[PDB]
């Protein structure tokens, strides 16, 4: 959005030193129990394990492929929530302009709390009036006293929580078959051999499953000076 | 050029020249050194420092000939 500042380096990828060292437990943790860093590396390890196995991709369904990469198959419930989330974020630093509100289609006023201050400017052209500010509280269909424009408050609330991308992913995504560490090892040997590492994440991940320091050059990789 | 700046005529004290309402002390509010001399009037201060030295009070400057010091820019 225009109100956001510049992408960080982390916005693209995370450093491999932030990979959890207990990979064996990481790949067995349920999604609802994974933190932001743990969830990043669960998806990256599992997603790259399937993508770096070309011979199996054509026989893998889009439902299974999306699960491996950690992408959520969309549906009307989740689409509604995500859309209203992105609309809330956009309105943080953007103007609020849209069609005239009526009983059939009230002006939708997203909010996290139970109230949001709103102003009615009336219709277009000569039907526009001076700003009339009012407090839009949930559970009431508001009508402007001047132009009769109907307003309504929409709350991004779900089960004692507000709506977030993390909440939407946890509520609607279902964990599939438990990730098999044999796949990690098999793909690791595929792209990492004879001092050539073409899957750096899988070389670090396999090292942790082995106990940290087992694979060649990994003790030297983990030895820091400050 | 500044190191060998030519002498200029002594200014005649004209109708509106050298007017003073009080002594020059803004540089030394408490010590009040050279109250009669102006802030960067080097020749007045030299003679004033000489009086203080003759009164057993040490002051710094205005004692070495220019041609006997480094960085003077006044040597032939």
């Amino acid at each position: 959005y225009r109100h956001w500042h510049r992408m960080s380096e982390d916005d693209w990828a995370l450093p491999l030193d932030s990979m959890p060292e207990d990979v064996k437990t990481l790949m067995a943790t349920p999604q609802t129990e994974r933190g932001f860093v743990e969830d990043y590396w669960y998806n990256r390890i599992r997603g790259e394990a399937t993508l770096l196995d070309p011979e199996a991709l054509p026989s893998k369904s889009y439902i299974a492929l999306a699960r491996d990469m950690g992408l959520q198959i969309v549906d009307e419930p989740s689409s509604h929530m995500m859309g209203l989330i992105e609309l809330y974020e956009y309105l943080r630093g953007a103007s609020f302009v849209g069609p005239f509100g009526t009983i059939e289609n009230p002006v939708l006023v997203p909010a996290v709390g139970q109230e949001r201050v709103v102003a009615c400017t009336g219709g277009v052209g000569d039907e526009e009036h001076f700003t009339l500010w009012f407090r839009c509280r949930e559970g009431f269909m508001y009508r402007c006293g001047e132009c009769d424009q109907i307003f309504m408050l929409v709350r991004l609330y779900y089960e004692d929580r507000y709506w977030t991308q993390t909440l939407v992913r946890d509520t609607f995504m279902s964990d599939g078959d438990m990730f098999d560490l044999k796949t990690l090892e098999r793909v690791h040997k595929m792209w990492n051999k004879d001092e050539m590492v073409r899957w750096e994440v899988g070389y670090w991940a396999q090292d942790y499953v082995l106990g940290k320091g087992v694979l060649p050059g990994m003790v030297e990789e983990h030895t820091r000076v400050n | 050029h500044q190191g060998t700046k030519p002498p200029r005529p002594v200014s005649l004290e004209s109708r509106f020249m050298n007017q003073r309402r009080y002594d020059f002390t803004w540089m030394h509010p408490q010590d009040k050194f050279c109250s009669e001399c102006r802030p960067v009037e080097l020749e007045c201060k030299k003679m004033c420092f000489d009086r203080y030295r003759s009164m057993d009070y040490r002051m710094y400057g205005f004692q070495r000939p220019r041609i006997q010091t480094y960085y003077s820019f006044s040597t032939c």
Partner: protein
């Protein structure tokens, strides 16, 4: 995560606080001095402020008084000059070496 009860019964049975009593226009004239001289928190804060303000006023006062007396006696060079005339009188010499220098 902390667990608290809905209510607590206090050990004492004193109703110390409540609504203000009806006050007149000049009620402050006696209530305010009463607080100053009878409420501990008020007169301990006053004494603390007065004591420490005066405490640090003394050393500054002593330094300035000596300085002020000196400045009235004359300029720095007038003081050194008086000690130079005295040294010239003690020795009976019209011209003596400057301080820190030999003959």
């Amino acid at each position: 995560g902390r667990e608290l009860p809905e209510y607590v019964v206090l050990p004492h049975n004193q109703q110390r606080y409540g609504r203000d009593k009806s006050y007149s226009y000049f009620t402050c004239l006696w209530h305010f001095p009463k607080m100053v001289f009878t409420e501990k928190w008020c007169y301990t804060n006053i004494m603390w402020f007065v004591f420490w303000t005066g405490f640090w006023f003394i050393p500054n006062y002593i330094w300035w008084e000596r300085r002020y007396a000196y400045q009235k006696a004359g300029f720095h060079w007038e003081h050194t000059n008086r000690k130079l005339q005295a040294r010239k009188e003690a020795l009976g010499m019209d011209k003596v070496p400057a301080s820190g220098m030999d003959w």
